[PDB]
Design a protein around this ligand. Sequence first.
Ligand code: FAD
Ligand code: FAD
Ligand code: X7Q
Ligand code: X7Q
Lengths: 393, 391
Amino acid sequence: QSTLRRAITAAYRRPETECLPPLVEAATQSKEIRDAAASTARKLIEALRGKHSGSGSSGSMMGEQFVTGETIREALKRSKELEEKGFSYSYDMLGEAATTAADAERYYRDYESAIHAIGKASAGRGIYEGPGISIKLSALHPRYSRAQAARVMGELLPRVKALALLAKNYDIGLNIDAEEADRLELSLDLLEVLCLDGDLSGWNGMGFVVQAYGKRCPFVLDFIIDLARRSGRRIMVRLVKGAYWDAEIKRAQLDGLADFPVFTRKIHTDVSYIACAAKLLAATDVVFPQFATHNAQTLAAIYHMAGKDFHVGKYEFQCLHGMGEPLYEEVVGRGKLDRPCRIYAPVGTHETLLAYLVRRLLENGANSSFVHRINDPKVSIDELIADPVEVVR
Amino acid sequence: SRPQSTLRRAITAAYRRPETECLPPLVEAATQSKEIRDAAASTARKLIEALRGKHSGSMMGEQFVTGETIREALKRSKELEEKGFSYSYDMLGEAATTAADAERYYRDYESAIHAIGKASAGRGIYEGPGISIKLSALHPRYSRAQAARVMGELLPRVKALALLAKNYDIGLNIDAEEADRLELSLDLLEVLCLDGDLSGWNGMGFVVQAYGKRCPFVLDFIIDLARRSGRRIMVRLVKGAYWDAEIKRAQLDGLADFPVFTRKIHTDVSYIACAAKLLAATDVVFPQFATHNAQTLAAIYHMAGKDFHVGKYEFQCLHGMGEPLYEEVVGRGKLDRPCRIYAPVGTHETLLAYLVRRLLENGANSSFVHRINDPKVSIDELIADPVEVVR
Ligand SMILES: Cc1cc2nc3c(=O)[nH]c(=O)nc-3n(C[C@H](O)[C@H](O)[C@H](O)COP(=O)(O)OP(=O)(O)OC[C@H]3O[C@@H](n4cnc5c(N)ncnc54)[C@H](O)[C@@H]3O)c2cc1C
Ligand SMILES: Cc1cc2nc3c(=O)[nH]c(=O)nc-3n(C[C@H](O)[C@H](O)[C@H](O)COP(=O)(O)OP(=O)(O)OC[C@H]3O[C@@H](n4cnc5c(N)ncnc54)[C@H](O)[C@@H]3O)c2cc1C
Ligand SMILES: C=CCSCC(=O)O
Ligand SMILES: C=CCSCC(=O)O
């Protein structure tokens, strides 16, 4: 318990109207930055609309567009082409929400075998230039959402620590994906224990996702930035909007709550994301920000907010396999923006793919999504480059 | 005793009966003769080889919607109607969260019935188009409010819609939704079938989900209701669209035994057993066999025997999924059996929930429509009778 932890708990269901003013202020950019971001965003979107990206490119319900390979060996082999273009990878062994001990055990073995393969393929490239892995805590505990948080974390900790130690041995990144809002606190407690565990000293590969659609986002970030500074671990922080919005709304509508744990207007999430990006960019000494987005306006805003100084390891962008390549082909490389992007790369069979595909459908099919609007003949470029702070009303 | 005590008790007793206890009667009821199984395998093999042959061997789901408005969807239906297909239109929208949303869905259904009835032009309930409705669209708290309150506000609304459908002589089908609303929807069906204001019209329809343990006992109740009401009830037999959600709900409810089967081939056996029940009651119900599975279709086609006329039974499929299969079914040179296309009408504001269920259907490794495109799955496996796996 701390003042920083108290701010997280206090924001859980803070009224949406009260959350917004501080985010609006922090997300407000100077005129020069806004003008430069508009120019960059226009250039990117014109390039995108000469392509055929977005929801129209999502492929068939077989989900072939979204999976990098069936096995880690297959996915690693297929990664060489984009790696020399300036992309990196974070591999996701598909599988989540284990319901039996056998399933949780299988997912653990999958993650463990992937770390060995990824770590050997990394070949000493380290946590920024080389590949990493992403895990879901719900894969590793058979009653992750339906058991007491204290006991869940206590059985989960040895498994996650063992995986982190393997990642340290090979010096690769290991990211904890963010899932449902009611599990933020548990996963954050796990992150704290790991960052204070002396067995993991000298390794900066521990990573953690924070969801900007959540009202707690800036306060989670303050806690993580402070944890990094005091632990000496340069935590990799993946800033995302969030993948479970429809489910969070449905659960909140059934819990009879007046105030949800997530925002309810998409523009509020966009303001939240930019405000939280400003917080992360002011903390690159102690954290490694990873800006996961397919929205060219969001990207261009962050690109200019970061300033002129850049080196590999300062920050990166990220995208999902099968969704982000058209945009980021206009970003990576010395002929573009010369900023790196890490591809989140699902690995598994068609069975383990289904739950992930449903979230990709809700993301690609929503009229509010950038990837849908980029292909919408009714949506102008002027609208696509609008600054969320200047639009909110 | 209470009216229909024996039939109603059998439904309640099956609700969460252990899966192993549900299956043996269904397996025996779904067992067909070797001669029928050989003929069905030949038919299924032909259907599958045609499926690929005419189709060279989309997640955003524009192919799942027939039109943005009922006028648009009706215009786009002429081509397939001329071939021998019929339609059931679905105004997209469900799970109304406010009384105003429910009123808006009601008005969409009312206007659609006028338009569909005009287009029907007296073709009747079998050859002409119909409508499908979801009760969750018509009550603002459908999954949550007590059945007494839901019934008292829902019944006048559904009765008014049924009266318009009667006035145009079109079909009106109540779609089946989550398992916890089966009982309410069935009580509503009974009151409507016994309502004299709807006399003379056989267009009332009702879905039963074969993935549910109550399915054969619900069918018993419906067939008996048809006999005592004098209505020939249209009965759409489906497997079911909410399986993933039912499993998650039952886990969250703490249940030791779920209201649905957990082995996919058990749902297939249930479907075939229930088809045998419906095919023996065509005097009092109109069976509508909704499936995209060529093996299920072939089994029912041969189970039904050589005697057929339009109005005896039909098949059904979803727009954007079933047309390739049923183009090998409708028509004198094919199987000479009719098919009604379930045709969603709406926009993105109402497409999400339906599209998610389509993705869970199309993307599941256990689904026929996925297995037909899976290089690991032989034609032998696609045509195999699942009843022989558990017999
Ligand atoms: C590499 C990568 C990793 C990711 N990891 C995770 C993870 O671990 N956990 C996680 O939850 N998400 C994660 N995501 C985010 C998620 O999968 C989506 O890709 C992301 O939210 C889409 O944002 P965008 O900026 O690309 O698009 P945009 O179109 O700009 O934003 C869409 C997002 O806005 C939000 N939204 C939509 N409607 C509303 C509304 N009415 N009110 C409020 N918010 C709304 C949702 O978050 C939606 O995804 C990750 C994304 C990437 C690219
Ligand atoms: C015209 C039409 C109308 C329909 N109306 C409705 C309706 O009102 N309500 C409704 O709920 N459904 C309805 N459905 C059914 C649903 O939408 C699917 O289309 C149907 O269940 C798929 O069955 P299939 O025989 O085509 O495919 P198959 O691949 O043979 O069967 C797949 C089905 O098996 C079941 N299943 C999958 N995995 C398991 C498992 N592990 N254990 C048990 N069962 C499993 C599910 O029902 C799944 O849909 C309708 C279908 C059609 C064609
Ligand atoms: C794509 C994001 C990574 S975590 C949530 C999901 O898997 O959708
Ligand atoms: C497609 C079937 C009719 S009812 C369940 C759904 O809408 O998916």
